[PDB]
Design a protein around this ligand. Sequence first.
Ligand code: FES
Length: 94
Amino acid sequence: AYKVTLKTPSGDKTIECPADTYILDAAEEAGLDLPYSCRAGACSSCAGKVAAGTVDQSDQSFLDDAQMGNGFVLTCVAYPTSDCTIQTHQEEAL
Ligand code: FES
């Protein structure tokens, strides 16, 4: 699996996430407790910010082009495409 380093307000926690699993789902499976609501890519509750590595969030429908260009990601609909580092709890930074 890809190694996803979640940089959370309570420390960095590196978890495994296969290519076919959403970041949020892998995080909750690993025992993390990240924000979410719709789980449909249509809000900002689950927003993170990619610091390194790549994700595929093609089905997202809330972030604009500039926000995605700055690394913002909807973790509920984002797959990893490499080992990656994602700062969590980023909704207030949007
Ligand atoms: S929880 Fe709404 S977009 Fe992820």
